[PDB]
Design an enzyme around this catalytic site. Structure first.
Site, PDB file in Angstrom:
ATOM      1  N   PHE A  60       0.840  -1.201   0.000  1.00 44.92           N
ATOM      2  CA  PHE A  60       0.000   0.000   0.000  1.00 44.92           C
ATOM      3  C   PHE A  60       0.871   1.245   0.000  1.00 44.92           C
ATOM      4  O   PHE A  60       2.019   1.197   0.437  1.00 44.92           O
ATOM      5  CB  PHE A  60      -0.910   0.035   1.226  1.00 44.92           C
ATOM      6  N   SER A 130       0.707  -8.131   1.801  1.00 44.73           N
ATOM      7  CA  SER A 130      -0.484  -7.928   0.972  1.00 44.73           C
ATOM      8  C   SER A 130      -0.121  -8.229  -0.481  1.00 44.73           C
ATOM      9  O   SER A 130       0.355  -9.328  -0.758  1.00 44.73           O
ATOM     10  CB  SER A 130      -1.026  -6.515   1.158  1.00 44.73           C
ATOM     11  N   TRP A 155      -1.846 -11.323  -0.926  1.00 46.17           N
ATOM     12  CA  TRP A 155      -2.947 -11.159  -1.877  1.00 46.17           C
ATOM     13  C   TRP A 155      -2.456 -11.517  -3.276  1.00 46.17           C
ATOM     14  O   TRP A 155      -1.447 -10.982  -3.743  1.00 46.17           O
ATOM     15  CB  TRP A 155      -3.460  -9.714  -1.849  1.00 46.17           C
ATOM     16  N   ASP A 176      -8.753 -11.309   8.569  1.00 49.92           N
ATOM     17  CA  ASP A 176      -8.413 -10.523   7.389  1.00 49.92           C
ATOM     18  C   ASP A 176      -9.586 -10.448   6.395  1.00 49.92           C
ATOM     19  O   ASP A 176     -10.063 -11.480   5.917  1.00 49.92           O
ATOM     20  CB  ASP A 176      -7.183 -11.155   6.729  1.00 49.92           C
ATOM     21  N   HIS A 208      -5.815  -7.449   8.592  1.00 51.05           N
ATOM     22  CA  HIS A 208      -4.885  -7.395   7.460  1.00 51.05           C
ATOM     23  C   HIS A 208      -3.575  -6.663   7.742  1.00 51.05           C
ATOM     24  O   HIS A 208      -2.540  -7.011   7.172  1.00 51.05           O
ATOM     25  CB  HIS A 208      -5.569  -6.753   6.250  1.00 51.05           C
TER      26      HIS A 208
END
Length: 258
Positions: A60, A130, A155, A176, A208
């Protein structure tokens, strides 16, 4: 084992906030064109030989997604740790894989001598959060010579990872909602070959961004995984096999004994 570094470990030593090595930092404005910069953390003491390295990717741009806390805490156990800045936005896990490899390639090919002279370029690892965790998986397919991979609450839309040849430790967060363990972490883990040294650790009650907050359960097993596979250090086997039973752990799976 010529890769062994530091005193023989204990339950306390792998949980230590600050390990046996002192740590210096090298700020990197850009470790590869287009991919942004990061911070290199490295052990200062050189009398035991060179060290392996791990690149650590966020997922992120938000500061909540920072991976900074891994830097000193893992480097002080005897690793070169390259934390990748959150500034550069990447929307695909494959890009994170490429970014991870670009950061490692910076260490090997472009870094200042203070880092280059402390680095064993044959012993490299990836870790990420992630889509950065999806990227950890991606990177091992892109580069099977990697020694270790640690996808943190990963992810990835691609659910099959049967071609991974790099020892892989997936950490999941029970609650999550962004990368649910049911549809990401667990399928990834179960798809890795039963013949691969692998583990899955799920954190009870975690969400998460659990990997972005200092967490002793994460740290102790990240350190043990990197030791066991980047350093081939079987002094750390004791913490990985048989399965850990820490109270913070919802479930642990492995292909122990390695």
């Amino acid at each position: 084992n010529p890769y062994e570094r530091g005193p023989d470990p204990t339950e306390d030593s792998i949980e230590a906030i600050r390990g046996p090595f002192s740590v210096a930092t090298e700020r990197v404005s850009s470790f590869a064109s287009g991919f942004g910069g990061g911070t290199i953390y490295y052990p200062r003491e050189t009398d035991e030989g060179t060290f392996g390295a791990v690149a650590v990717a966020p997922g992120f741009t938000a500061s909540q997604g920072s991976m900074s806390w891994y830097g000193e805490r893992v480097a002080s156990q005897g690793f070169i740790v390259f934390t990748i800045d959150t500034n550069t936005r990447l929307d695909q896990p494959g890009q994170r894989g490429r970014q991870l490899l670009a950061a490692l390639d910076y260490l090997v090919e472009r870094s200042d001598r203070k880092v280059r002279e402390r680095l064993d370029p044959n012993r490299l690892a990836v870790m990420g959060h992630s889509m950065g965790g999806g990227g950890s998986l991606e990177a091992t397919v892109m580069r099977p010579s990697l020694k270790a991979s640690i996808p943190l609450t990963p992810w990835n839309l691609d659910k099959t990872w049967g071609q991974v040849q790099v020892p892989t430790f997936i950490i999941g967060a029970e609650l999550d909602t962004i990368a649910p363990v049911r549809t990401h972490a667990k399928p990834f883990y179960e798809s890795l070959p039963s013949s691969l040294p692998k583990a899955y650790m799920e954190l009870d009650g975690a969400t998460h961004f659990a990997p972005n907050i200092p967490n002793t359960t994460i740290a102790k097993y990240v350190i043990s995984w990197l030791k066991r596979f980047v350093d081939e250090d079987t002094r750390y086997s004791q913490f990985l096999c048989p399965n850990p039973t820490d109270r913070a752990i919802e479930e642990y799976r492995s292909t122990c004994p390695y």
